Design an enzyme around this catalytic site. Sequence first.
Site, short mmCIF file in Angstrom:
data_model
loop_
_atom_site.label_atom_id
_atom_site.label_comp_id
_atom_site.label_asym_id
_atom_site.label_seq_id
_atom_site.Cartn_x
_atom_site.Cartn_y
_atom_site.Cartn_z
N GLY A 170 2.21 6.16 9.61
CA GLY A 170 3.61 6.03 9.23
C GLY A 170 4.29 4.81 9.83
O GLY A 170 5.44 4.52 9.46
N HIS A 174 0.81 -1.21 0.00
CA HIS A 174 0.00 0.00 0.00
C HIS A 174 0.87 1.29 0.00
O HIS A 174 0.31 2.38 -0.14
CB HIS A 174 -1.10 0.00 1.08
N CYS A 182 3.44 1.68 9.33
CA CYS A 182 3.40 0.51 8.45
C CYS A 182 4.77 0.10 7.99
O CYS A 182 5.66 0.93 7.84
CB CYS A 182 2.45 0.67 7.27
C1 LIG Z 1 1.29 3.19 7.19
C2 LIG Z 1 0.10 3.89 6.62
C3 LIG Z 1 -0.88 4.24 7.71
O1 LIG Z 1 -0.52 4.93 8.65
N1 LIG Z 1 -2.14 3.72 7.64
C4 LIG Z 1 -2.67 3.18 6.42
C5 LIG Z 1 -2.68 1.81 6.20
C6 LIG Z 1 -3.26 1.30 5.05
C7 LIG Z 1 -3.83 2.13 4.09
C8 LIG Z 1 -4.58 1.56 2.88
C9 LIG Z 1 -6.07 1.85 3.03
C10 LIG Z 1 -4.42 0.04 2.76
C11 LIG Z 1 -4.08 2.17 1.56
C12 LIG Z 1 -3.77 3.51 4.30
C13 LIG Z 1 -3.21 4.03 5.46
C14 LIG Z 1 -3.00 3.78 8.84
C15 LIG Z 1 -4.36 3.09 8.61
O2 LIG Z 1 -4.48 1.88 8.75
N2 LIG Z 1 -5.37 3.90 8.32
C16 LIG Z 1 -6.75 3.44 8.36
C17 LIG Z 1 -7.24 3.41 9.77
O3 LIG Z 1 -8.28 2.48 9.86
C18 LIG Z 1 -9.01 2.68 11.04
C19 LIG Z 1 -2.42 3.44 10.20
C20 LIG Z 1 -2.74 4.20 11.32
C21 LIG Z 1 -2.40 3.76 12.58
C22 LIG Z 1 -1.74 2.55 12.69
N3 LIG Z 1 -1.40 1.80 11.64
C23 LIG Z 1 -1.73 2.26 10.43
#
Ligand SMILES: *CCC(=O)N(c1ccc(C(C)(C)C)cc1)[C@@H](C(=O)NCCOC)c1cccnc1
Lengths: 304, 304
Positions: free
Chosen positions: B143, B41, B145
Site C-alpha cells: 500500500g 500498476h 506505492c
Molecule cells: C503498492 C502495491 C504494493 O504494495 N506492491 C506492489 C507493487 C507492484 C505490483 C505489480 C507487480 C507491478 C503489479 C504489485 C504490488 C508491493 C510489491 O512490490 N510486491 C512485490 C514484492 O516483490 C518482492 C510492495 C510491498 C512492499 C513495498 N513496496 C511495495
Amino acid sequence: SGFRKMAFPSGKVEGCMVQVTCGTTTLNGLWLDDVVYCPRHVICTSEDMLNPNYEDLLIRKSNHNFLVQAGNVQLRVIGHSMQNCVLKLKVDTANPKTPKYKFVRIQPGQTFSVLACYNGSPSGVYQCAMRPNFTIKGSFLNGSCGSVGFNIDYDCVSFCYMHHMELPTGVHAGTDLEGNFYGPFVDRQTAQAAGTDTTITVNVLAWLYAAVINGDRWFLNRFTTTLNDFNLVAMKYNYEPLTQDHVDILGPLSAQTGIAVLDMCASLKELLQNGMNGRTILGSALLEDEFTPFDVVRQCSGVT
Amino acid sequence: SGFRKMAFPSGKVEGCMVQVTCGTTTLNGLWLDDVVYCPRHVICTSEDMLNPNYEDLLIRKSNHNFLVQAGNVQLRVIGHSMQNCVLKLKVDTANPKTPKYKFVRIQPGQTFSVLACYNGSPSGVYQCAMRPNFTIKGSFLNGSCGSVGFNIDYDCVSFCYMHHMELPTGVHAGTDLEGNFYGPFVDRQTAQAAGTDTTITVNVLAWLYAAVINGDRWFLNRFTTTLNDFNLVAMKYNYEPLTQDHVDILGPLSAQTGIAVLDMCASLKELLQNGMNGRTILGSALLEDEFTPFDVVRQCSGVT
Ligand SMILES: *CCC(=O)N(c1ccc(C(C)(C)C)cc1)[C@@H](C(=O)NCCOC)c1cccnc1
Ligand SMILES: *CCC(=O)N(c1ccc(C(C)(C)C)cc1)[C@@H](C(=O)NCCOC)c1cccnc1
C-alpha cells in the site's frame, strides 16, 4: 519490508513554529492556541548566560519587548509569564493551524521526532530518544533553541521536548512543555557533565525483532537466558536493566515472530559477548537503541 | 553541534498526498495543481502483476474507475493518461495546498526525503539515497506505492521519486515523476535482481568532514594519497570511483576544516584497510554514505 529511522510527518508542528526575539536574542517559539512557548533564556544577553537570575531579568521586560513573528507577520503580545524554564507569551491571535495537542513528559528510552528550526523556520526533521542520562543526541546549531520534540497519535500531537542548550560535550538538554528540564540540567552557562549514557536494552530487543521481521536473522542463537542472568551481562556492558514490564511490552513482537523474549535476550547476550564480527543488522554495525517496541510495531504495521 | 540523518520538513508534501483506488487496488497519489500522479500498476489485479500489458489494461478503464480521495473528500476525475509508468489523473479541482514544485531526475548517490504513506495518509518521513545500482533502501509496506521522494530548496519542492515496488531482495525500485524507472527495473512481478550496491565515496568523505566539524577526529591520519591510488583501494572495497568533480564538490568542506580532500581520502583509505577497531564515527560503526556534500553543508550551516 525495510526498516528506517523514521520521524513523524512534521507538517502539524511546522504550522506552530514562530520566531521569538528579545533584545538581540532570537530563537524559536511554539504557537498553540493564543500562547507562544519558548525557552526563558531568550531574555539573556552575552553576560547573563553565566549566572542568570531569570526573575530579575524578566522584571526589565514588558510585553512589547517580545517580538513574535509567524511567517512574515508580527503577532501582538498581550501577556507574558514564566513557568519553570519556559516563557509563555499570550498573543491576541489563536494559531489557526493549532493541531489537537497534549503536553507530555517522557521517560528515558522514549523516542520522539525533532523539527529543527532556525528563525522560526523548519530546517529538518529527525528521530531522537531521551537517553537514560536525560540528554538527547540531536543536531542543533546556534539559534535552534525552542525547536520541539513530539510524537503523533493519529491527529493529536504530544509535545514532549523543547530544546534549550548544548552541554560542553556536544549533547543536548531541554525541557518538557511545562518548562521542567529533563535530568538535572539548568539553563546557565556552567559546568554540566552528563551521566553514563547506557544503552536502552528494551529498544535494542525491539530492533532485533524488527530485524527478524525484515529477514536479518543471522544473529539468532540456539540459547535462552533468564532476566537475572541477562541483567548481569547487561550491567557489564552498560545496558539498562531489563524488567518484566519491558518483557510484557515486547510481547506483541515475540508473538509475531515466535521468538520468546528471553531467547532474544540470549541472542543479544551473545552479540554483546562476541561482537558483530564485521556483520551488520538492518544496515547497522552496532546495536540500535532508538526504536521503542511501539515504534517497531508502528513501522512494521504502517500506522498513519 | 551533533549530526543526524535528517529529512526535509514534510508538510509541503503532506498537503499533496491523496488516496487512489482502481477496482480493488488502493495506493497513494500525488496531487499537484489539477493532476494526481500515481503508479500505473494501480490498474493491476492479482493476476495482471505477472505479465501486465498496461495499454490493454488501461483500455478497460474510464475516468470514473479511478477513485481519488483527498482527506475525506472525493475528487472528480475528468481525464486520465499514461506517461511511461505513471498515470496522470486530471481532476476538476486544483490542489489548494500545491507548493512551488519541480520534477527532477536524480543521479545515483543523491539523497532525498521519503514521506511514506498508506491510503493517502502520511505515516513517516525518512532520508534515503539513490544507490549506485538504482535501488533505494526504504521502509515500504503493501500500500506504500505512490509515496514520493523529494528535496526542498527554500519553498520549492523538487520531486525526484515515486515508489513502485519491492524487489525479491527487499530493496526498492521506483520512477521519477515522469514515470521513468530509476535503473533497469520494470513494473512487473518478475525476477529482477539488483546490481552491486557500491558505497558512495563522495558521500562518505562528506560525512567524514561532518565528523571533523563535530569533534570526531580520531580517524585523521598523517597520510595523503592521489586520486588514482585512492581509486585502486576504492575499487577493492566496492566503493564508487572518486572523480575531480567530487573533489571540487568537497572544496567548501575542505576549506572549512583545513583538511585537503586527498588527505581525507588517505584517512578513508586507512579506515577501509584497518577497519574501525570497535570505534565509532558520529555514532556509527560503519562509514555512512547517505549524506551528500550539500547535505553536510546544509546541516552544518542551518539552512531553512
Ligand atoms: C503498492 C502495491 C504494493 O504494495 N506492491 C506492489 C507493487 C507492484 C505490483 C505489480 C507487480 C507491478 C503489479 C504489485 C504490488 C508491493 C510489491 O512490490 N510486491 C512485490 C514484492 O516483490 C518482492 C510492495 C510491498 C512492499 C513495498 N513496496 C511495495
Ligand atoms: C538557542 C541559543 C543557543 O544557540 N545556545 C544557547 C543556549 C542557552 C544559553 C544560556 C547560557 C542558557 C543563556 C545561551 C545560548 C547554544 C548553547 O547551548 N550554547 C552553549 C554551548 O554549550 C556547550 C546552542 C548551541 C548549539 C545547540 N543548541 C544550543
